Design a protein around this ligand. Structure first.
Ligand SMILES: [Mg+2]
Ligand SMILES: [Zn+2]
Lengths: 14, 1112, 170, 104, 221, 7, 111, 105
DNA sequence: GCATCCGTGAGTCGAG
DNA sequence: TATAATGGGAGCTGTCACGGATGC
């Protein structure tokens, strides 16, 4: 939904 | 002349200062007169205190602020297009925690707009008004659930932009739900976050059996405040890591953080009074000693359950009640935007604090004032509540400042606005005028503050009443809110009094708005005046009680639109309010103390007071207002005249000897006239123009700039290519038209030349050039000319240049020149006239005096009003006004007839009798008896039952005159009107709607860029819109060619319109239409959406409307 | 069906999304330019990130942003937050916005238009007029009939030619 | 007491009213059955019978034991044009819409 | 943020910076990666801000000059208690800077405004609706050029075929280009002196006829 | 403000 | 021929490219100093056509005599400036992108 | 039919030392009744020169042959110390009502 | 079979 | 071009009635 949140999640993966 | 006033009601208190709602608000917000240490926690000081301290280790703190003097006075700001403002300095100190180093400095934050003496602002040279907003007061409300009866909603509402609305509802599944940011979750969870044990919630909510059981969830109580907090955080923030400090941060910011969440002081008070509790802070909870503590939530839940159960002393709320609706005035709105800009400045501060060098950082380096400046400027420019001030007449300004709007930021939108909020609530009594509102889309949304009404410190509108003890009416006056007013039985202001005691066996009163007949023992309070029920405008309508409300609305609204007349007069029948309006509006100039007049001039009045000091008052002379009406002050005193305190020194616009003058007093006959007064049209006498009645001065401002370009500079000069000396006749050496010259459409106000756009002359131009042997000039005539339909005398020129002292323009501009042109406007056909009772009409005919109906003594009437306008409209006030107007015509006197305490028929009849003696006995002494025509008319009236048979002609004529009717002679024949006609003096105004401003026509002119359709509007020389419905009309007529012309030849068909113009100047019939350009625009815009639109023939083969130009 | 996916995003002719110098020499322009610029910036950055062998998270983010850019261009505010210009809450006006609504191309410029040879003024009762007649102010008529008037002025000695007549009526 | 513009719009949009009257889907004879607590109206043909359960406070346009046409209103209120369409056919609906709009 | 680029854009450009830092890193220096990365990241973000943020693109050095002018003016206003004049800014900028340079620098720095900018409190008025099209000729201008061409033909028809054609060639009515004397002379098969002479007499007869009928006068504005 | 032109 | 019917249909990438007179490779609009359009920008005269009638950007061919001619120096076709409201450009995407009309319009046609 | 006042460029102006503005001065001059004796005489320019403090009346106009002011008590202006008024007022024969706009004299 | 979500509509000139 | 620095930040809350797509 929120692109920034999504990206911060994908970053939070590694 | 003598002023006779009617009515028995003695007003205990005068009207409060009418601009106070603006003035005291802004003064309270700024606190400029208060020494910094004595300032309160309200206003811009509040915003400073909320923003600071700024932490995260550097810490920026706020000591105090100060406002300097304005760099320029108001007038100079108006001329130079500046903003009247004061420099705002803030003393700040940076403290490094570890080092202990403290650097202290006073930083310049830019400017803040100062409110003028009359409660307005000057923004970029133009006067503006910040309109008060009305909204739902913050607090805790309980409203019926529209779907399920028996269930209710508990809404917790903070101030706008102060954090989220919170809803509490008992769900069909039995559990209590909380809604925040559109998230439904069980309330018990948050209850656990606040640290509530099941035992406490059980003993508290146990009194209500079924509900508290639905509150009980063991999975929640099996948790800890930490675990519950993190659970709630995971519920409100999916995907966001549930760190402890982050959850604490979020929940604190959502509920307990005073900076993020703010109930107003009013929200605080109302919550306290409703829930029967005491609030510590303005938030719903606190963070204390490491954990959270509840404030509002439990009392709210308790009340909600109590209301659901039916427990006494619990009611729903009327959200339209004026106890639940408050006002945000100038101070609050400005303070709000100040808070926002300050917050941004703070963000910047934390940025610089992190990035900057740790050894040396001053507050000056940390603070960028720009965002704050931007916020303030934005508020005073682009806000919906910041409106162009209406200066048309002084009453317009005064009324504008007293406006209340439900619209704007944090307010309603006209879509969300239904009948309920637009209704007149019973609680509007004494607070918001039931009468004056717009007729159209804004009806009920834009309202007016009642005359005696006041806005308290909490923002609630309060109206005055008077204490009544034991049937005795005191002089003690008490201002209550609607909530307080609901607690009492309040008698009407007209209840008969002998001394201070009420004498009636039965009195008419209100209890919670409900009309009730009570004994004097039951009367707690009594109204101050009928005036308090209405607005300042509505209070200017005499015989208001005789006018239907719908037309009172129109009269009210239209008084605002009255144009100041050079000869302007106060009404023959006034309401008694005419002077206070002039005084409060700061229109007139008054004497400061008792004294003697030293000097009297057109430009100046010098007064010597008791102090022996010589005080000089400059008079504003032929100044242009926002609406182009001329505002000028004329001296009403003379040299050597002694003046006491509060005496009138000078009349401003629309003021006759200190009385509000919105129009003329004219002699009207109410009769049909040859269809010229058909459907509200009005017939006037040329005699009105002869004596300059309804003549008004209007000043228009024209402006031109000469700037640096890449093709060479534009320049303001008298040297204009291809122009004769006839055209430059009135131009001065520098190229500017000279003061005193008369300008007409097409005339040059300011000469200007601009270097030509680069072009290779077409072979036609080259050949013509060689033929006439004249070199093509490299500059062209850009000069500013008088637009069509305008003109006048040039009264002013302003010339500002780059390189001139005290003058710096916007980049690239070499010079700016303004030309002020004044015009004297006589009344003409199509001009709008109106009275205070809602009778409006456009002048359809101006007859020479000999054609006018006249009295037997040879006196012609001024105006002919059609009687057909009366019955359906039901405004009889104008008739009474006319009748009394007749009396005062012959007695030579003016009247004050207060609203609802009035002049009554019998009194008017007495005055009419005296007047009749004046009007007749004179004739009888002059040696003339009754006329034959008068005899015939008397026979007619005798058949109508107007006069009694057997009486003498004089007796009967008097009988008619007491009915306000007189014999009237047709000027064209000499034979009398068959019936006697109502004739008398009426107060009529010339409204701001003038055909001279509205008349527009165009053949061809500028076209739009993309659509290639004509521009809109008179100022742009635009074409009229032929819209979907006009198209429907042409379709319905089956007129295909007229329509096709509208769609093509006359608008966006380029080739078509060109060929049409040429065809017409040639005398050929117009060529066949082509494709309208906007269809091509449609095709290409659909192509940009990746849709292929193809025009095809009957062979289904593509047709190119772009004629190969779009295809490779 | 695959044409419902865009490999190549079309670009509107510039005159339909003008960059124009207004009276004061300052520039005014359509939002479509800003939308297109977002699009081109993100696309170019995508090509450079590809050519340079960027990690998958980065390329994913870039592609997502590219799709959202295209969305903003074609229909703005249709999915997700509407794209706004810096320092303003005003949504940018996309092609969909241009087409539809009361202010849209169809209703504003197509089913209705502003027209030439038109005027307006206040009305006044005509009682002397015959049913088929209306009073028309002289000057309004002079403007509305203007080309005809030039022609008729040339038909007589009133002016040497059309241009002379017009310069005379100026 | 007029329904006015919203009624006109209700008809032109062919909207299912919330004031909706209950109509018979077929022909038959009316047998009313009313418990003090609950009320119902049955329409009985020779071949088969149908049941209409409605709130007990509803105004009935029917007398017990009466023969009603298909689509004929059992209760007061505006008719659902689509129900009237499935029941009595297109002409009936045309007549209904026209007369109804004209009433206002 | 707030500098003209979206958060995600700043992030992506910063990622480009991160890539540069990765390819340029030396572990031998024993410095942690974040130190060397941060430099290139800030570099890429700032380059992006300078390059993309304007509808009308400005060179990075010029953007630096403009921002410097801004900071200068802001400090000057911070100590002056008011916005500075061009002269004061010029003083604070140093040698090479006068009032005119500051003024023009501020001029070229001006960003465009939206055509869709709303006008009035309603939603029905765009700022672009007030802007006329100066490019496309008006019906009046078109008709005037038409009558001009027709009249020029009328006047040229009072000459002979040759002199009218010479004039049309030299003035560019034929192919649009203006031929030299040698071209019209080689075309009609005469000397350039001769063709110049017949051009002269053509123009002369046109002058006489024009003084006579006063027909082409009004097209001279 | 609309209706028949009060404002 | 007379216009009879009007068809509307999906446009293929090939069709879209057939429409385009050039690809816009740069976000640039006009040059800050010159106020002329920038090469490969949204306003480029090379793509969308001449700003002045029958005159190229560099000013090598200023006259109508050249028609359809393209300047070697500035790459600008000499023709009527009107074409600037007609000729489409295009942008070639690295990753294909869905047209939101066929996604967000329910029920989704792609879906 | 016309009024000239020294150091006054138009009707919209005020004069130092004079209470009335020019609009009012003209409004007063519009009440002026001027009788002509000789029927042959079409126009007369009445010259006025005055200074204050005084109240300038219609009587203060410099006399002309065969010209009688029928209302000498008619007020014209109020002049103050230092206030100076110099006027030339053109009075014509005529019929009916002809507005300033029409004759432009 | 039926609650609830989301998207989309909500008057015309005039001026601003 | 090198100390080290490693998940953001506002929401905006008083219409409404419909139609059509998902969910018990
Ligand atoms: Mg210097
Ligand atoms: Zn070229």
């Amino acid at each position: 939904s929120d692109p920034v949140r999504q990206y911060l999640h994908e970053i939070g993966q590694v | 002349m003598e002023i006779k006033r009617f009515g028995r009601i003695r007003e205990v208190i005068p009207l409060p200062p009418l601009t106070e709602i603006q003035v005291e608000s802004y003064r309270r917000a700024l606190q400029a007169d208060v020494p910094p240490e004595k300032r309160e926690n309200v206003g811009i000081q509040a915003a400073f205190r909320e923003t600071f301290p700024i932490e995260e280790g550097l810490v920026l703190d706020f000591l105090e602020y100060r406002l300097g003097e304005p760099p320029f006075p108001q007038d100079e700001c108006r001329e130079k297009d500046l903003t009247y403002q004061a420099p705002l300095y803030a003393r700040l100190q940076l403290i490094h925690k570890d080092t202990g180093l403290i650097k202290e400095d006073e930083v310049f934050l830019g400017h803040i707009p100062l409110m003028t003496e009359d409660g307005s602002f000057i923004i970029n040279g133009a006067d503006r008004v910040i309109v008060s907003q009305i909204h739902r007061s913050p607090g805790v409300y309980f409203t019926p659930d529209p779907a399920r009866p028996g269930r209710y909603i508990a809404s917790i509402i903070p101030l706008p932009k102060r954090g989220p609305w919170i809803d509490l509802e008992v769900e069909p599944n039995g559990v209590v739900s909380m809604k925040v940011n559109k998230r439904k979750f069980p309330l018990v969870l948050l209850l656990r976050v606040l640290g509530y044990d099941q035992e406490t919630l059980a003993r508290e909510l146990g009194a209500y059996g079924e509900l508290v059981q639905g509150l009980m969830d063991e999975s929640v109580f099996a948790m800890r405040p930490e675990e519950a907090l993190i659970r709630l955080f995971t519920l409100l923030r999916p995907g966001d890591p549930p760190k402890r400090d982050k959850a604490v941060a979020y929940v604190y910011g959502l509920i307990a953080d005073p900076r993020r969440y703010d109930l107003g002081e009013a929200g605080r008070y109302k919550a306290e009074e409703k829930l029967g509790i005491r609030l510590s802070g303005r938030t719903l909870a606190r963070f204390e000693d490491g954990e959270f503590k509840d404030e509002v939530f439990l009392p709210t839940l308790r009340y909600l359950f109590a209301l659901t159960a039916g427990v006494p002393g619990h009611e729903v709320d009327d959200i339209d009640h004026l106890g639940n609706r408050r006002i945000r005035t100038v101070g609050e709105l400005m303070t709000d935007q100040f808070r926002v800009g300050l917050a941004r400045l703070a963000r910047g501060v934390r940025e610089r604090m992190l990035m900057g060098s740790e050894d040396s950082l001053t507050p000056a380096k940390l603070v960028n004032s720009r965002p704050l400046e931007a916020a303030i400027r934005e508020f005073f420019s682009r806000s919906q509540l910041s409106q162009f001030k209406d200066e048309t007449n002084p009453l317009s300004s005064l009324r504008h400042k007293r406006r209340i709007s439900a619209l704007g930021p944090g307010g309603l939108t006209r879509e969300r606005a239904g009948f309920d909020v637009r209704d007149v609530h019973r609680t509007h009594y004494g607070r918001i005028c039931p009468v004056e509102t717009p007729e159209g889309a804004n009806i009920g949304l834009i309202t007016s503050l009642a005359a005696y009404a006041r806005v308290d410190e909490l923002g609630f509108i309060r109206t005055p009443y008077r204490r009544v003890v034991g049937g005795v009416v005191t002089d003690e006056v008490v201002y209550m809110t609607a909530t307080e007013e609901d607690r009492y039985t309040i008698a009407q202001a007209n209840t008969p009094l002998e001394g201070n005691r009420i004498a009636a066996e039965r009195v008419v009163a209100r209890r919670k708005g409900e009309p009730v007949i009570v004994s004097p023992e039951e009367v707690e309070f009594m109204d101050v005046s009928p005036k308090q029920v209405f607005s300042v405008n509505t209070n200017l309508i005499p015989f208001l009680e005789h006018d239907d409300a719908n037309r009172a609305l129109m009269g009210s609204n239209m008084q605002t639109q009255a144009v100041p007349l050079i000869r302007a007069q106060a009404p023959v029948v006034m309401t008694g309010l005419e002077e206070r309006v002039v005084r409060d509006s700061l229109a007139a100039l008054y004497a400061e103390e008792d004294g003697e007049v030293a000097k009297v001039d057109g430009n100046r009045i010098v007064v010597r007071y008791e102090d022996g000091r010589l005080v000089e008052y400059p008079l504003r002379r032929f100044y242009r207002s926002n609406q182009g009406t001329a505002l000028d002050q004329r001296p009403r005193v003379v040299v050597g005249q002694r003046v006491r305190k509060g005496d009138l020194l000078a009349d401003g616009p629309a003021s006759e000897n200190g009385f509000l003058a919105l129009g003329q007093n004219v002699l009207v006959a109410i009769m049909p006239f040859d269809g010229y007064n058909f459907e509200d049209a009005i017939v006037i006498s040329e005699e009105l123009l002869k004596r300059d009645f309804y003549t008004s001065i209007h000043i228009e401002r024209y402006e031109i700039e000469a700037r640096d370009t890449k093709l060479g500079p534009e320049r303001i000069t008298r040297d204009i290519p291809h122009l004769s000396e006839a055209a430059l006749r009135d131009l001065d050496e520098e190229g500017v038209v000279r003061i005193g010259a008369e300008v007409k459409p097409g005339d040059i106000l300011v000469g200007r030349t601009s270097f030509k756009g680069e072009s290779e002359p077409t072979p036609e131009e080259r050949l013509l050039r060689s033929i006439f042997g004249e070199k093509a000039r490299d500059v062209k005539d850009t000069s500013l000319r008088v637009p069509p339909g305008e003109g006048g005398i040039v009264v002013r020129t302003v010339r500002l240049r780059r390189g001139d002292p005290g003058v710096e323009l916007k980049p690239g501009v070499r010079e700016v020149v303004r030309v002020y042109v004044a015009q004297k406007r006589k009344l003409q056909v199509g001009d709008k006239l109106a009275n205070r009772h809602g009778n409006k009409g456009v002048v359809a005919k101006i007859l020479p005096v000999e054609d006018m109906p006249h009295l037997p003594d040879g006196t012609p009437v001024d105006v002919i009003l059609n009687p057909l306008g009366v019955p359906s409209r039901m405004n009889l006030g104008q008739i009474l006004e006319t009748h009394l107007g007749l009396a005062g015509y012959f007695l030579g006197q003016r009247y004050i007839s207060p609203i609802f305490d009035g002049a009554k028929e019998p009194e008017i009849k007495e005055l009419l009798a005296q007047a009749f003696e004046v009007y007749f006995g004179k004739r009888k002494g002059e040696g003339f008896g009754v006329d034959k025509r008068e005899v015939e008319v008397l026979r007619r009236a005798e058949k109508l039952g107007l006069v009694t048979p057997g009486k003498t002609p004089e007796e009967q004529l008097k009988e008619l005159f007491l009915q306000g009717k007189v014999v009237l002679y047709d000027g064209r024949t000499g034979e009398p009107i068959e019936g006697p006609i109502v004739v008398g003096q009426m107060f009529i105004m010339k409204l701001y709607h003038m055909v001279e401003d509205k008349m527009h026509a165009r053949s061809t002119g500028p076209y739009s860029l993309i659509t290639q359709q004509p521009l809109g509007g008179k100022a742009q020389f635009g074409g009229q819109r032929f819209g979907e419905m006009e198209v429907w009309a042409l379709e319905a007529y089956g007129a295909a060619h007229t329509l096709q012309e509208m769609l093509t030849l006359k608008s966006d068909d380029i080739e078509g319109r060109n060929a049409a113009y040429e065809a017409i100047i040639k005398g050929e019939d117009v060529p066949e239409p082509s494709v309208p350009e906007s269809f091509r625009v449609l095709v290409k815009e659909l192509q940009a959406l990746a849709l292929d639109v193809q025009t095809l023939d009957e062979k289904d083969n593509p047709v190119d409307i772009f004629e190969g130009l779009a295809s490779k | 069906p695959e044409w419902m996916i865009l490999e190549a995003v079309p670009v509107l002719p510039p005159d339909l999304r003008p960059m124009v110098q207004v009276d004061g020499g300052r520039f005014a322009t359509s939002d479509l330019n800003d939308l297109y610029r977002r699009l081109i910036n993100r696309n170019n950055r995508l090509k450079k990130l590809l050519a340079q062998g960027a990690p998958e998270i980065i390329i994913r983010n870039e592609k997502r942003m590219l799709q959202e850019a295209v969305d903003a261009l074609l229909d703005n505010g249709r999915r997700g937050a509407p794209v706004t210009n810096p320092g303003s809450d005003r949504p940018l006006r996309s092609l969909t916005d241009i087409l539809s609504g009361k202010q849209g191309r169809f209703r504003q410029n197509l089913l209705g238009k502003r027209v030439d040879y038109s005027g307006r003024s206040v009305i006044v009762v005509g009682p002397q007029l015959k049913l088929h007649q209306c009073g028309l102010p002289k000057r309004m008529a002079l403007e509305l009939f203007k080309p005809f008037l030039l022609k008729k002025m040339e038909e007589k000695g009133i002016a040497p030619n059309v241009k002379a007549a017009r310069r005379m009526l100026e | 007491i007029t329904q006015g513009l919203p009624r006109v719009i209700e008809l032109f949009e062919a909207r299912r009213p919330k004031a909706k009257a209950v109509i018979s889907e077929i022909d038959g004879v009316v047998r009313i059955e009313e418990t003090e607590e609950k009320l119902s109206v049955f329409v009985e043909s020779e071949g088969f019978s149908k049941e209409y359960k409605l709130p007990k406070e509803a105004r009935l346009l029917v007398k017990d034991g009466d023969y009603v046409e298909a689509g004929q209103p059992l209760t007061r209120g505006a008719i659902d044009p689509h129900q009237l369409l499935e029941a009595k056919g297109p002409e009936a609906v045309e007549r209904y819409l026209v007369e109804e709009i004209q009433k206002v | 943020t707030g500098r003209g680029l979206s958060f995600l854009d700043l992030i992506q450009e910063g990622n480009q910076g991160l890539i540069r830092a990765v390819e340029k890193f030396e572990y031998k220096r024993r410095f942690k990666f974040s130190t060397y990365a941060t430099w290139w990241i800030r570099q890429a973000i700032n380059r992006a801000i300078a390059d993309q943020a304007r509808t009308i693109r400005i060179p990075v050095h010029m953007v630096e000059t403009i921002n410097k002018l801004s900071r200068t003016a802001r400090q000057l206003q911070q100590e002056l208690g008011r916005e500075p004049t061009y002269e004061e800014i010029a003083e604070a900028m140093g040698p090479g800077w006068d009032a005119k340079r500051v003024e023009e620098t501020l001029k070229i720095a001006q960003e465009p405004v939206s055509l869709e900018t709303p006008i009035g409190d309603e939603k029905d008025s765009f700022y672009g609706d007030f802007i006329p099209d100066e490019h496309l000729p008006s019906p009046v201008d078109a008709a005037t050029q038409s009558l001009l061409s027709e009249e020029l033909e009328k006047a040229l028809s009072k000459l002979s075929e040759r002199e009218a054609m010479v004039l049309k060639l030299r003035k560019g009515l034929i192919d649009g280009r203006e031929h030299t004397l040698e071209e019209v002379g080689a075309f009609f098969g005469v000397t350039r002196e001769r063709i110049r002479q017949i051009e002269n007499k053509a123009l002369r007869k046109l002058k006489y006829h024009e003084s006579r009928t006063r027909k082409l006068r009004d097209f001279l504005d | 403000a609309x209706x028949x032109x009060x404002g | 021929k007379e216009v009879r019917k009007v068809r509307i249909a999906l446009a293929s990438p090939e069709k879209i490219r057939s429409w385009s007179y050039g690809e816009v490779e740069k976000p640039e609009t006009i040059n800050y100093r010159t106020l002329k359009p920038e090469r490969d920008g949204l306003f480029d005269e090379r793509i969308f056509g001449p700003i002045k009638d029958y005159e190229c950007a560099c000013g090598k061919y200023k006259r109508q005599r050249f028609e359809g001619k393209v300047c070697e120096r500035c790459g600008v076709e000499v023709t009527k400036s009107i074409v600037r409201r007609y000729r489409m450009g295009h942008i070639e995407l690295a990753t294909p992108a869905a047209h939101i009309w066929f996604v967000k319009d329910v029920p989704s046609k792609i879906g | 039919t016309s009024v000239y006042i020294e150091d006054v460029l138009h009707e919209f102006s005020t004069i130092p030392g004079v209470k009335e503005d020019v609009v009012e001065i003209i409004l007063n001059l519009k009440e002026l009744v001027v009788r002509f004796l000789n029927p042959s005489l079409q126009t007369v320019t009445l010259l006025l020169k005055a200074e204050g403090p005084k109240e300038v009346k219609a009587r203060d106009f410099l006399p002309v042959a065969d010209v009688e002011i029928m209302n000498p008590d008619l007020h014209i202006a109020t002049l103050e110390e230092g206030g100076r008024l110099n006027m030339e007022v053109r009075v014509d024969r005529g019929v009916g009502y002809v507005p300033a706009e029409k004759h432009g004299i």
